[PDB]
Amino acid sequence: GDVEEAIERAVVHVADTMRSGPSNSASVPALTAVETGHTSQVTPSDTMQTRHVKNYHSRSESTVENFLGRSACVYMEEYKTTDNDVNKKFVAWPINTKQMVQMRRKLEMFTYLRFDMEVTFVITSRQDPGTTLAQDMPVLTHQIMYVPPGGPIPAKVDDYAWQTSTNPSIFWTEGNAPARMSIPFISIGNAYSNFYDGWSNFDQRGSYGYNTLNNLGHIYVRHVSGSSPHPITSTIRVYFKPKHTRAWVPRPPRLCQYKKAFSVDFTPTPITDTRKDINTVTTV
Amino acid sequence: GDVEEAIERAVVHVADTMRSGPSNSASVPALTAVETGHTSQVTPSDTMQTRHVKNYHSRSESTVENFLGRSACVYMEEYKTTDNDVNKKFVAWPINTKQMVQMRRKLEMFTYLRFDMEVTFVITSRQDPGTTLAQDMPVLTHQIMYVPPGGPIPAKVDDYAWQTSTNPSIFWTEGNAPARMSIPFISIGNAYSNFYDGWSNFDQRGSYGYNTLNNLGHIYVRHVSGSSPHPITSTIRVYFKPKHTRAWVPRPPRLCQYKKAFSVDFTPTPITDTRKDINTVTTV
Amino acid sequence: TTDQMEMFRIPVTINAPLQQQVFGLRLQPGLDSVFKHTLLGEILNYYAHWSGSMKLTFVFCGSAMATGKFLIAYSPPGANPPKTRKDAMLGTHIIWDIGLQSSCVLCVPWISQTHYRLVQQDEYTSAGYVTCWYQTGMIVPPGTPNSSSIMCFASACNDFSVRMLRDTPFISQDNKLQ
Amino acid sequence: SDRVRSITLGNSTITTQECANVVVGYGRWPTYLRDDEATAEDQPTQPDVATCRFYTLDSIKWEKGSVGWWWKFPEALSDMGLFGQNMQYHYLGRAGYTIHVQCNASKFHQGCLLVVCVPEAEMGGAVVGQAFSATAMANGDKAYEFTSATQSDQTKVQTAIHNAGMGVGVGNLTIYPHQWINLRTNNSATIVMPYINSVPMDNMFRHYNFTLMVIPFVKLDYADTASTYVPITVTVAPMCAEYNGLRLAQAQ
Amino acid sequence: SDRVRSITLGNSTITTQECANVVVGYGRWPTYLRDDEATAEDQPTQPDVATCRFYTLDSIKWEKGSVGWWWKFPEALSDMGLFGQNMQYHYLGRAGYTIHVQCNASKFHQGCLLVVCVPEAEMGGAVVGQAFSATAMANGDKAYEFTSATQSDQTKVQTAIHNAGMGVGVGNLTIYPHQWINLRTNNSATIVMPYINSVPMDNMFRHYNFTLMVIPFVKLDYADTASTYVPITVTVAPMCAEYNGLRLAQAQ
Amino acid sequence: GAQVSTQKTGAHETSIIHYTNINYYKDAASNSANRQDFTQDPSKFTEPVKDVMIKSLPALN
Amino acid sequence: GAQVSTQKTGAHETSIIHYTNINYYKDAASNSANRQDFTQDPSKFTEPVKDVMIKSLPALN
């Protein structure tokens, strides 16, 4: 009514070590058949004498919610306040999570993912170097607009599309706390796919790979009415923080360095690094 | 449920003075044997006639929580907005509490300490002097990233490591309240050690001293996209305030001035200052 | 190494000198090249602290007709690693006999002065060595290959946990992709 | 099956996929000295896991012409970790043992060993009347060997195998705790020896309580296999070790 | 009287006819590691009487011009019987100690010693910035000595007595467990140190848990007596010693 | 309707350690993270075998 | 679940002097300091002697 008792007063720990003494039996825990595709459930008490240890360690920091739940930079680009080239004055980004290596490797440890998304923007501006820099420009305001697939796309900073009568936009002024908002799980499927071993056409032709399922739309950003006498360059950095996460069918982590944003493509890389012989255990 | 009664309506005071009259007995409180390693529990009433005094004085301000619980500057460094030298543009600090003398002396009054830590950052910027200073630079934003031991370290302001997909970072804009956050007790041991009379190698070789137990990681800080036409120098000051503190085995305070950040090393200093003779009690 | 797949094959042969060493490795699951890229090592590399026991399962892949006994041991840290089977047998070990059950599990216990060790392991946080020796020898009847391979699997036990989330040293970039 | 066996003492475990049973002393499991059987009055040390664990001695080669070997206890273990250390610092000691003799071959090899533990295996000299030194019968974990021919070297013990160095019939050694390793069925032998002596405790250097003998009754034989020798390894674990009369360590 | 005192650990007993009290750690009596405070999972050895007994180090001479001495633990006991042996074979160890410092003179002698146990007595080098080796602070039961003059030898620790090698005031060492031997009243000092560390167990070679310092605050003096020096002897007994992580012995 | 639950333990021994939360938005997507769910099952991965296998007994036959 | 406790006395004579607190974070490390715990024991340091010594009676014999 007023207060509610969702208290988790009983939290999970790591397994205790049971005291274990000598044995002489036909029962043999240490011998198994790896061939079954089974990982052994052996513990020290099975193969040696152990003392009792009340273990209070907890796996709290390794839940998928926690592992994925930190904001990571997924994109960055610059847009000028004034320039002769129309395209240098605004950013148009096709939303995806494959261009920044760190976030990509983490998400890619799972095949399917389902989560809500917290998006934070970090926008900074700097005056371009030049011969004459004296000016007195008022504070800048930026507009970030999300255009769902199929909506009208802006062709220049001053076009009608920026009216956002229906698309969601954020107007933010410099000097303030970074802009932020939440987006729910928006896939047309039941989970987001990090990989897709298939084609776009029924023919088994067309696009191949996860890129065929990426149609989340674009993010467009411009200065509001910020034309300055001497150019100023703003850089926008977008951060993603998944929350209320669920993950399915885990995969080996990416070993080879990434080469392309929209394909699994790689260059063969060795299993691991080498040492002189199979018995080398020293450093020098 | 709604309200809770953690009220400390009964707080501790300093001992009262009991009235005490004349005596003539075989019982002798003032004579003892310092040799036992015992400090006498004598009070004025044991050796003279006292009146009764209801003492309301309290030792509240001298609890270890209170003594250690004030923010203290533990480090400061400068980083430029623009410079030819890559390293002059960002700070890389190996976290420790031995470089600033005041905090060091306080912590070092105890051998072991266990506490949570409140960290506050004070960042200020100034335009470097020069022949031509006219410019109009927008507000600056800084990034402070914590790199736990073993994580990728940034080699320049613009490198991939600054993505922080997993390391914790703070993005802060000038003109605002100083950045701050709490860190829990993160030692791999049961308490932090201020001293360590030992070696790193089992051999009794390698590093000697507390420095062998210091592996808390680094703090890296840079301007976000702050390249300015004329250089600006930012200075970061980091403050530590221990909270929820516990301290064990107290030691004599440091008498000799400190000489090194990572060693106990000192130059012999006399016990105290002198006076002309053992009876001198005047000032002039 | 000529062929990459050879890295997974531990060589074992007939008429090996008595008490010969089969292999030796140092226990730094997150740092040593032998473990750093395994499932366990990859997970460890997103953290800075670790604690718990480990399972090293060995599977004999020779013919059903070959026989052999091996001594597999774990030596808690000390100034010097074991150089001889006599040295090794003083520590935690198991004597593996080959038969119908092809695999054997050496469970290396958590023996440490601290509750947690660093993933970026150092001397203070040293964990020791795991070594393998011929207990008897690999004997073979007529008409079977002269040498065979042994494989090693690794995983964490139920008392294992990691702490302090951090970025991994194993992935990087100089440019945005595209 | 029962052929499967697992034994854990201290920080060591032994496993066998093809065994017979486990022979236990004279049906007597090792046990600590009781108050009603003691003479030495000082509180004893019982190091437990530090001493009661498996120690593997140096291996040996069983070849077609091998004749037999012996090891005397506790001497054979005098250099083994804390067991040896405790032997050195104490005047008196007492212990039982789990003896595990290992020997694997193949389904195409043949051979058969007797694995026996002879209590008080007092031996005769190579030349009657001539005294020999301790070195003629024991020295750390060094395996001593019997011979087919009768021994001539007076510095040695009478090693002729058929009399087992004791003047008795070698085929009658079966009255002592034993097991057979017949290559056709076994791959190891396990004998648990309890403490057997005429006094409650004894000095561990001066008295060899029992001798382990491994004797090929049926010679090692095989056909065109690339394997030549078949190794034999002895692993033993002290049990219920306790010591009395602490003082300075005995130099050797 | 209470001056009379008798202490028995293992096969050794200490007696004193003129003592003060017995100082006990920070009011904490030595005790074995509990299950809820342990990390290392293997079953430990607790040798008991074999290790928990009194060991007497080499004696030293207190002369009119002596300035002070120190011994680092457990290093000082690394060669003492089975205590030293157990230190060598194990990666981890844990123990408390009963320290008994002996010093008898006569009713006509005068002098006063501070007997302190300093936990984590990390020391500074003779020349700041210059590293020294383990040998500059400990080596078996060898007593190390402080000096009046400030140390110049860079291979040494800064031995100037008034700063106790730690950069603090020597007269403030009293916050650590201590007792005074004032020749006029005492003849010995007994301090029981519990295990104090930031981790449950630790390696015994690599870490000196505490340092015993014996410092003459009032110089030894006497008249026309034929006795010249007054010996000082240190006898110490480990208490509740337990070890984990058995493996091969550390060479040194 | 405020929810009150326990905090993750700090440097000090544990009652004063509970925090309170109130949701301010109409969409659950707006809510903070589920930092405190510790349900866990490693057997889909460590033992996906049809017939259950007890450690003491041998694996084959 | 708000906690209500007493304040440290001010210039004026003492009921109106209690303050209220509510924790907003999921980690106890985030909580404010324990400025008000006054438990205290000087005897580990002032008298670590095995046998207790009453002031009135002599120290030796």
Ligand SMILES: Cc1cc(CCCCCCCOc2ccc(C3=NCCO3)cc2)on1
């Ligand atoms: C980021 C990222 C990862 C990928 C794979 C895409 C996974 C997205 C899962 C479903 C998201 O919602 C959809 C929106 C549009 C489409 C679509 N498929 C054909 C082209 O557009 C499908 C799903 O590529 N970039």
Ligand SMILES: Cc1cc(CCCCCCCOc2ccc(C3=NCCO3)cc2)on1
């Ligand atoms: C494909 C795919 C799926 C994923 C995760 C990507 C999905 C991320 C959610 C999409 C978020 O897109 C935004 C929506 C709106 C706004 C925005 N609204 C107000 C102004 O900006 C910004 C981002 O991994 N692979």
Ligand SMILES: Cc1cc(CCCCCCCOc2ccc(C3=NCCO3)cc2)on1
């Ligand atoms: C600050 C400061 C004080 C010190 C002493 C260090 C005390 C820290 C206590 C434990 C902190 O957590 C650890 C992290 C890493 C290591 C480590 N030891 C070997 C190298 O890294 C040990 C403890 O030196 N600098």
Ligand SMILES: Cc1cc(CCCCCCCOc2ccc(C3=NCCO3)cc2)on1
């Ligand atoms: C060693 C030692 C231990 C001590 C106290 C030092 C420990 C201090 C705690 C370590 C704090 O380190 C930080 C962690 C993270 C951040 C940070 N996170 C968000 C961005 O900055 C900053 C400091 O005394 N000696």
Ligand SMILES: *C(=O)CCCCCCCCCCCCC
């Ligand atoms: C839940 O609302 C039941 C109890 C009401 C508590 C009062 C709320 C305190 C003020 C915050 C209101 C939130 C409005 C966005």
Ligand SMILES: *C(=O)CCCCCCCCCCCCC
């Ligand atoms: C504790 O919560 C029980 C009583 C609820 C009091 C209402 C809280 C007042 C508004 C603060 C909410 C805190 C959300 C961060």
